[PDB]
Ligand binder design. Structure first.
Ligand SMILES: [Mg+2]
Ligand SMILES: [Zn+2]
Lengths: 17, 654, 216, 49, 55, 249, 420, 16, 215
């Protein structure tokens, strides 16, 4: 387990488009 | 972990009486973590010792004090186990006695025995010492039961076992949750949070009890009084008890009516069928307290404010806030309910943005504590934070389909059906059973001890008694456990007056009827009182679309962040062997990291059209960029159609 | 044709009631049908009265305590939930309790109206120390079986158990053509007599099999 | 080295390289398949050949 | 019923000599079905039709 | 239901938009969030005929991932058919499974036609059956078809056919393991039999009644069979009748 | 269809159910096999519940001759140790004798357990659920109602102290430790075996990932010879089980006349495999991926059947992945001279007529006794009271009885081996 | 390699 | 308050009727109660008529033959034990058969009285060859349930009008735990499945009525 696998990505959720 | 091998993870003949040969983890940690035995201790050099009684001319000198000894010391002596039987005073009975000499098992005349172990449970740990009829179990199932005894959940009303082992009052006095009176006097004040005892001739002692606190594992650390006001109390008498103790001693499960027989497929392969009494009688219900946290930080745009002026919300969802933006103590919160209301200054009045803390999906309960910590109040807040709000939410969980139930002898199961008490099999007196267990799981797993406890527990219920049987109890007779159980059952039958309790043709079996039709089963079945435990852990998870990883743009993993399930390479192989090509291609691109095909697929599903063809997933482009960044000129090419043309390098990143 | 007689009737210390009935002559296996139908209806489809809600003055959730009261709120709820009552009006009722000072609060301290009656005025509820006041308001409703909370202000809901009959047993004996004699034993909690639970179960069965008598 | 022994023997007994290689590979293949199948069936496991 | 669909599926898998090819045909047919129907579920109707066409 | 309402959310949204009065995606999402009664009806009419793939964590062979048809159940646990447990090597003592849902028409067709659990009968590694009944099913069949000399109430009675024997057992006239005779015309396999007729009796006609250990065949002189009576147990009659009913239907 | 079921008038264990399912699939299809399996599941679940099968302590029946068997074994052990103490035998012969004694006592006790189960109570729940093949074995009933036997040290050495109790009687502290040794060994074995099994499966997948069926026929005349797998006298895998799904590379012929049983290029089903086994061909030449000359793969004719469907493989089937998975799936599923020899005991009382016919060389056996080692296969001749002896020795056998002796009832006569 | 790039695998229904 | 609806009804060739009924809404646990009680009463406590004894001219024991009759006494007895009759009078009746010559002896050849109705008029009984005369006398009685036995040959008559009863309990949940009973009844044709259901319900109501007004 690493920290980098718990951070979301910046973008528009497919749902919000 | 990668360097430890077969030799290190095994049992060494020098572990005898110092490290338990049973209690270990299962999996990558098997044999690498151990447990100290019951009587073992560590001396001032750092070596584990264990006690022995001296034997002079075949006589065990229990008058003298135990002689402790390390592994190297007890290699030249002939040491006998703690299950050897001695007669009046101390002489050892028998003509041949098992001993250990130089890490080997031999037999000698009982005039050449040097030391004898103090107790028959000197070889096992404390968790394994709590399993009655342990010598009738396999070692793997003993391991399972000892490990699962430490995953039991404190229940709403705990209850002592009927077939306890004798170490229960000692396994609870060290956790420091049971209160005993150090004074031989009277009790003057009893309360849910305070106890006071006045010495017969002396000062008053006062104790405060913890109430509905929270452990590291979200269980409850309650403490309740036992005594009443104006009660005569002796020194060393139990005054208060913990969340897993009844009256002095450990109580991790409950005693319930059990029958060993198959149901209509609901007992299949370790599944468990229980009755509905375990739900409405509040058996196997527990309190779990969870903690939620919200942070008020300071952004470059501005600070964050905790208030009820939340955007895009109506007054129907701000009922239980305390006019400061934080929920009130004693409020029932359902899923998605706001706990603390927070606003962030976004940059683009109509400027605040909502990131208030809410209950996670699938969580509900009462709010029991709302603690606030701010730098003004003299609290050590994080470097960049300006308010830390912590909310504690408690709930009562009942036994339900999907929960794990266990016994002390290694028999685990998952509940698959909860029958109304008029569908469960019933006894020749009209009593429906509480749990039906499959007997198919008993002989292949060699945990016969569960079939002894049940029977003794049956007698214990019928005789209003509680039995303390110690492991390895066959040093007194040829078959001590069976004879004691049969004698107890016969005594219960004679005392109660009901002949159907115990039968001589089938000792442990009595007639049982069908609650659905009223017809008796073809043959009598084994029924008794079994001590079952409810294990911890919130595992159900599902996802359609959520957050994605930073580099690969693949869905995150984890229940707490709407994570996806991993489709490893073994699953890819399985799909390749089926001949599936479209399921595999949809899994690999459209449902994981085809950054443009995900939205198209979702839009096609919502609108009802057909899902379009995918493109190149983002992880491949990331890999090509990384390989180029490694000074490799790797590229993708499109072959030329005609003769006198060059192949053209294709630009994926467009 | 057959004659149903009551052989024995007792009353336990907790005001629960026991009744044994002899039914004969049935017809070579009709005893099992009758007995099992009666047992299923008695244990499953009888309406009872139970305390469905409670409000304890001074608290607002189940995980609290009252100063001077030996029991915690959750224990008081678990004791009130097992209080047996029998109502005469087909409406929910409110019973009021207020005890002060050194006392052992019991079911006799609950004062319902003239309609609701407490079967056991010895049910333990709480122990109050000197200077402590316990004030409660209970709500009783009609129902059947186990009702789970569905989640009227500050009243703590309870998982109600309307089960007026606690144990049913039966045995078919040979009363010799071969004839059957059914022996039916009923244990109730005292809300209703065993004879009135047998009567209600028979009424439910008759109403259950009536629509199939001549419609088909 | 069993492969080398078979190849050396067959490259003379027969005289052509291609057939010697084929026969040596065939014998080694049979040995390997039989050994693996025997090991698997010792524990009572059945897989097709 | 579900059983009926299962029997029809097995019926189409045989007489086709290629489970993959007949899965592709069922997919195509169901696609056309839904397309010219949006104007029961597509794959189900496709299997029903193909079974009824096998006479 | 909790898993299904999240796995099939886009399909539920589409059917709410199309077959109901829902205007936009936001309204459908808030309706789902508030757990409207219509949501469960839409989900139930969405998931029917929609295959879903179940996988166990160690996928050692291609039978570790199999397609099923979902049925909405109330609880937190996935209900698995007991006949597919050996294929998954799964037991109900804490095991967990992962559920995937195909999206495209090709994917659903492939799941139904290739990966469906009702089509995975033989082991792809050896060709042997893998959906055979095991554990309690085997014990029940064995008990039904065994022989119990202790309980043979009604032994020796003759029956017209298998249904007559089953009805007699259902009433209680004949015990489960009684040795009775049933008039069955067909192929019979009886262990512990003898190919040599035990007793041959020629009546006052051209008819011989050869009595084997478990059979009684009346045959015309230099002719064909006229009747066959099998000596069997009503449990075996029940087993064979169940097999025959499953095959015929 | 069209195949009427046979009335199975017999007991139905797991083998019979598996046979019935296979027959149903072979004759009726895959959805009637599914229906039949569901119906059988329902019937079994119903009548395992009506039976009231349970487990008790008296259901675990120990034979009543366990005590006398243990007493006789202990008497033999005492004689052996008294011989060792007096210098008549060395230490490794005392060890060998006591190990063989307790292994023979364990085998005899297991036989007595099975006979007692099959004789007194043949409807016992433990016997019913272990003999039918539902949930159980014979190495587990042995440890429940028989005797645990000889165990091993954490290093591999056989502890000469055996476990003489079951789980019904209850082990002692010493037997619990000796059992925990092997329990731990197995636990650590499983923990460390899972990674190796996964690694092997991955390596297999990568070695043979490109083996996909692309061709219909490579047009060859090569294949291998399939024959039964036998351990000398005994066979382990019959030829019919090894000949299922293969394709013949040459026409096979019955070895009694000129009747052909298969032509060239013909897949073999269960019926043809059984016919070949019945007629005793003992060798069949078949096509194979070992001998097919295609383009970096196998063809449809050299592969043969796909075993999951009982048909020839389809086009574009990844048979390499299937092979790797088939080899790797059972990867995680991976005491001294007992019945591997054979003692010969004469149940007669008569004089010895061995004379000097066979080559008897004096020999000291694995125990402390002295006997005669024989390598010349010779038929034993002994005056066995009423009639003579027809016993046959084997090469390398060890005979204990010499001439001029008096043999009694069931006295030890010889030992025959079965095939530093 | 069609798995790594994300194409239809050349086996099964993606054969041609 | 529920509604019983006959979903399906059939009349098989052997004149054996079939019916399926849906009963709903039922409370939880009442589906099993109603189904099991109805099944027991239908299969064990309904009155019917069957051939109790028979006399054949030319024989005296079950294991005997009749010249010219393909079947023996045992086969004829088994073919007559499943003959379905329905009597209109509580008095035992006697039927007489006297077919002769080449013929297929079926149920229609039995000369029962006006009060006895043969449900299946073509029910195979025997096959007579040339110059064969089958003289038969059948006795019909009123009884309940399959009744095995210990001049006229005594038979194990099947008095059951109802042949088979199955029931299943589904969940008719709309949105508590409601149950739905699906009851399948196979009758030999002497009674329609709705008449059998009506008689079973009448028997159950008569059993449970006296347990209501007194105790
Ligand atoms: Mg598991
Ligand atoms: Zn080839």
């Amino acid at each position: 387990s690493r920290l980098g696998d718990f951070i979301e990505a910046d973008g528009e959720t497919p749902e919000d488009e | 972990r990668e360097r430890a091998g077969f030799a290190v993870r095994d049992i060494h003949p020098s572990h005898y009486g110092r490290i338990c040969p049973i209690e270990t983890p299962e999996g990558p940690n098997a044999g690498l973590i151990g447990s100290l035995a019951t009587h073992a201790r560590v001396n001032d050099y750092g070596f584990i010792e264990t006690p022995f009684w001296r034997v002079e001319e075949g006589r065990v000198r229990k008058d003298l004090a135990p002689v402790y000894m390390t592994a190297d010391q007890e290699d030249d002596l002939r040491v006998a186990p703690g299950d050897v039987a001695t007669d009046d005073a101390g002489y050892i009975l028998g003509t041949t006695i098992p001993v250990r000499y130089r890490q080997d098992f031999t037999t000698t005349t009982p005039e050449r025995v040097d030391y004898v172990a103090l107790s028959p449970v000197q070889i096992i740990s404390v968790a394994t010492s709590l399993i009655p009829f342990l010598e009738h179990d396999d070692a793997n199932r003993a391991l399972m039961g000892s490990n699962m005894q430490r995953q039991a959940v404190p229940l709403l009303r705990p209850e002592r076992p009927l077939v306890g082992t004798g170490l229960e009052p000692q396994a609870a006095r060290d956790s420091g949750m049971v209160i005993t009176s150090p004074v031989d006097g009277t009790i003057s004040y009893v309360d849910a949070t305070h106890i006071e005892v006045t010495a017969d001739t002396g000062e008053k002692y006062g104790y405060a009890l913890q109430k509905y606190q929270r452990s590291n594992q979200d269980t409850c650390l309650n403490q309740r009084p036992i005594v009443f006001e104006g009660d005569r109390v002796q020194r060393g008498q139990v005054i208060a008890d913990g969340s897993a103790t009844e009256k002095g001693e450990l109580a991790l499960g409950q005693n319930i009516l059990v029958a060993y027989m198959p149901w209509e497929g609901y007992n299949y392969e370790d599944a468990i069928l229980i009755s509905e009494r375990l739900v409405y009688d509040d058996v196997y219900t527990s309190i779990h307290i969870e903690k939620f946290e919200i942070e008020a930080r300071q952004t470059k745009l501005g600070p964050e404010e905790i208030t009820r002026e939340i955007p895009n919300v109506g007054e129907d969802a701000l009922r239980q806030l305390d006019e400061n933006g934080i929920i009130r103590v004693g409020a029932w919160v359902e899923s998605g309910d706001i706990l603390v209301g927070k606003v962030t200054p976004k940059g683009e009045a109509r400027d605040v943005r909502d990131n208030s803390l809410r209950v996670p999906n699938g969580e509900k309960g009462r709010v029991v504590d709302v603690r606030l910590f701010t730098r003004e109040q003299g609290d050590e807040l994080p470097p960049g934070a300006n308010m830390v709000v912590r909310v504690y939410v408690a709930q009562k969980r009942k036994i339900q389909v999907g929960d794990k139930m266990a016994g002390r002898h290694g028999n685990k199961g998952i509940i698959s059906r909860i029958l109304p008490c008029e569908d469960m099999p019933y006894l020749p007196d009209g009593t429906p059973l509480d749990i039906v267990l499959n007997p198919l799981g008993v002989p292949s797993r060699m945990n016969v001890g569960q079939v002894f406890e049940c029977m003794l527990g049956w007698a214990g219920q019928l005789l209003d008694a509680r039995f303390k049987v110690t492991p390895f109890d066959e040093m007194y007779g040829a078959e001590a456990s069976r004879l004691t159980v049969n004698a107890k059952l016969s005594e219960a039958r004679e005392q109660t007056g009901q002949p159907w309790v115990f039968s001589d043709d089938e000792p442990g079996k009595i007639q049982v009827y069908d609650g659905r039709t009223g017809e008796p089963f073809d043959r009598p079945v084994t029924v008794g009182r079994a001590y079952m435990l409810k294990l911890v852990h919130d595992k159900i998870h599902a996802r359609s679309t959520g957050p994605y990883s930073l580099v690969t743009q693949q869905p995150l993993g984890g229940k707490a962040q709407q994570g996806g399930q991993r489709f490893g390479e073994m699953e890819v192989w399985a799909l390749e062997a089926y001949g599936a090509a479209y399921i595999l291609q949809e899994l690999l691109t459209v449902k994981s990291d085809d950054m443009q095909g995900r939205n198209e697929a979702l839009n096609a599903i919502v609108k009802g059209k057909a899902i379009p063809r995918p493109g190149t997933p983002e992880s491949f482009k990331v890999l090509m960029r990384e390989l180029q960044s490694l000074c490799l000129d790797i590229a993708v090419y499109k072959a030329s159609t005609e003769d006198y043309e060059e192949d053209k390098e294709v630009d994926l990143m467009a | 044709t057959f004659q149903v007689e009551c052989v024995e009737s007792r009353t336990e210390a907790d005001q629960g009631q026991y009744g044994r009935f002899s039914i004969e002559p049935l017809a070579r296996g009709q005893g099992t049908t009758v007995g099992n139908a009666l047992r299923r209806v008695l244990l499953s489809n009888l309406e009872g009265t139970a305390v469905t809600a409670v409000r304890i003055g001074g608290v607002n959730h189940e995980f609290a305590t009252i100063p001077g009261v030996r029991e915690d709120v959750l224990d008081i709820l678990l004791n009130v939930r097992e209080l047996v009552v029998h109502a005469h009006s087909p409406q929910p009722q409110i019973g009021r309790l207020r005890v002060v000072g050194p006392a052992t609060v019991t079911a006799a301290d609950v004062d319902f109206g003239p309609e609701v009656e407490v079967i056991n005025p010895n049910h333990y509820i709480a122990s109050l120390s000197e200077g402590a006041t316990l004030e409660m308001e209970l709500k009783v409703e009609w129902g059947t079986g186990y009702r789970a909370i569905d989640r009227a202000l500050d009243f703590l809901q309870l998982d109600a158990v309307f089960m007026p009959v606690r144990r049913v047993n039966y045995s078919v004996e040979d009363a010799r053509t071969a004839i059957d004699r059914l022996v039916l034993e009923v244990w109730t909690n005292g809300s209703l007599s065993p004879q009135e639970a047998l009567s209600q179960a028979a009424s439910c069965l008759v109403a259950l099999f009536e629509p199939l008598k001549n419609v088909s | 080295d069993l492969l080398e022994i078979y190849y050396d023997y067959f490259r003379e007994q027969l005289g052509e390289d291609y057939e010697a290689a084929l026969e040596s590979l065939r014998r080694v293949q049979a040995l390997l398949v039989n050994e693996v199948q025997s090991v698997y069936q010792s524990q009572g496991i059945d897989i097709s050949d | 019923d579900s059983q009926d669909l299962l029997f029809k599926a097995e019926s189409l898998i045989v007489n086709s000599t290629n489970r993959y090819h007949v899965t592709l045909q069922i997919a195509r047919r169901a696609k056309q079905a839904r397309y010219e129907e949006m104007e029961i579920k597509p794959v189900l109707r496709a299997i029903l039709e193909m079974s009824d066409e096998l006479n | 239901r909790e898993m299904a309402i999240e796995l099939f959310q886009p399909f539920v949204i589409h059917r709410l938009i199309k077959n109901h009065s829902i205007n936009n995606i936001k309204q459908a999402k808030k309706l789902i969030q508030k757990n409207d009664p219509l949501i469960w009806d839409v989900l139930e009419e969405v998931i029917e005929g929609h295959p879903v793939m179940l996988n166990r964590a160690p996928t050692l062979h291609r039978l570790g991932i199999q397609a099923f048809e979902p049925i909405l159940v109330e609880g937190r646990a996935i209900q698995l058919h007991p006949l597919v447990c050996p294929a998954f090597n799964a037991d109900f003592d804490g095991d967990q499974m992962a559920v995937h849902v195909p999206l495209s028409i090709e994917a659903q067709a492939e799941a139904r036609m290739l990966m469906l659990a009702s089509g995975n009968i033989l082991s792809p590694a050896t060709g042997q059956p893998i959906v055979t009944p095991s554990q309690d099913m085997v014990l029940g069949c064995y008990y039904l078809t065994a022989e119990n000399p202790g309980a043979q109430k009604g032994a020796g009675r003759y029956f017209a056919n298998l249904e007559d024997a089953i009805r007699a057992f259902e009433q209680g006239s004949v015990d489960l393991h009684a040795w009775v005779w049933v008039r069955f015309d067909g192929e019979v396999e009886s262990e512990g039999e003898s190919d040599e007729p035990e007793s041959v009796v020629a009546a006052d006609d051209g008819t011989v009644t050869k009595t084997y250990r478990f059979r009684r065949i009346r045959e015309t002189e230099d002719g064909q069979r006229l009747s066959q009576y099998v000596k069997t147990t009503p449990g075996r009659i029940l087993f064979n009748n169940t097999v025959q009913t499953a095959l015929i239907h | 269809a069209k195949s009427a079921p046979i009335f199975r008038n017999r007991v139905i264990d797991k083998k019979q159910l598996k046979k019935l399912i296979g027959w149903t699939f072979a004759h009726y299809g895959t959805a009637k096999t599914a229906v039949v399996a569901d119906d059988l599941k329902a019937l079994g679940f119903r009548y395992a519940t009506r039976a009231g099968v349970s487990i008790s302590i008296d259901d675990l029946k120990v034979p009543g001759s366990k005590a006398e068997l243990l007493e006789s074994a202990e008497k033999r052990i005492q004689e052996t140790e008294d011989r060792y103490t007096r210098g008549e035998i060395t230490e490794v012969e005392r060890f060998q004798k006591v190990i063989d004694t307790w292994a023979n006592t364990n085998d005899e006790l297991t036989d007595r357990v099975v006979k007692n189960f099959r004789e007194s109570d043949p409807l016992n729940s433990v016997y019913m659920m272990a003999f039918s093949g539902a949930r159980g074995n014979i190495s587990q009933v042995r440890q429940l109602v028989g005797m645990r036997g000889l165990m091993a040290n954490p290093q591999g050495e056989i502890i000469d102290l055996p476990i003489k109790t079951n789980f019904r009687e209850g082990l002692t502290v010493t037997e619990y430790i000796i059992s925990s040794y092997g329990a731990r060994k197995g636990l650590v074995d499983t923990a460390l075996r899972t990674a190796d099994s996964g690694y092997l499966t991955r390596r297999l997948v990568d070695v043979s990932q490109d083996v996909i069926i692309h061709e219909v026929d490579c047009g060859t005349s090569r294949g291998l010879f399939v024959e039964a797998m036998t351990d000398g006298d005994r066979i382990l895998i019959p030829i019919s089980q090894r000949l299922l799904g293969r394709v013949t590379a040459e026409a096979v012929l019955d070895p009694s006349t000129d009747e052909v049983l298969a032509e060239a290029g013909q897949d073999i089903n269960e019926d043809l495999a059984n016919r070949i086994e019945k007629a005793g061909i003992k060798k069949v030449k078949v096509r194979s991926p070992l001998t097919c000359e295609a383009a970096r793969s196998v063809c449809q004719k050299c592969y043969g059947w796909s075993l999951a469907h009982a048909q020839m493989v389809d086009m574009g089937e990844a048979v390499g992945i299937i092979a790797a998975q088939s080899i790797g799936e059972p990867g995680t599923q991976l005491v001294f001279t007992g019945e591997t020899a054979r003692l010969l005991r004469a149940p007669v009382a008569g004089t010895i007529k061995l004379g000097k016919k066979a080559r008897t060389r004096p020999y000291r056996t694995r125990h402390g006794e002295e006997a005669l080692l024989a390598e010349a296969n010779f038929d034993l001749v002994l005056e066995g009271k009423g009639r003579k002896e027809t016993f046959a020795i084997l090469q390398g056998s060890t005979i204990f009885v010499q001439d001029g002796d008096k043999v009694a009832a069931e006295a030890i006569l010889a030992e025959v081996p079965v095939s530093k | 390699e069609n798995v790594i790039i994300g194409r239809l695998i050349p086996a099964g229904t993606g054969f041609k």
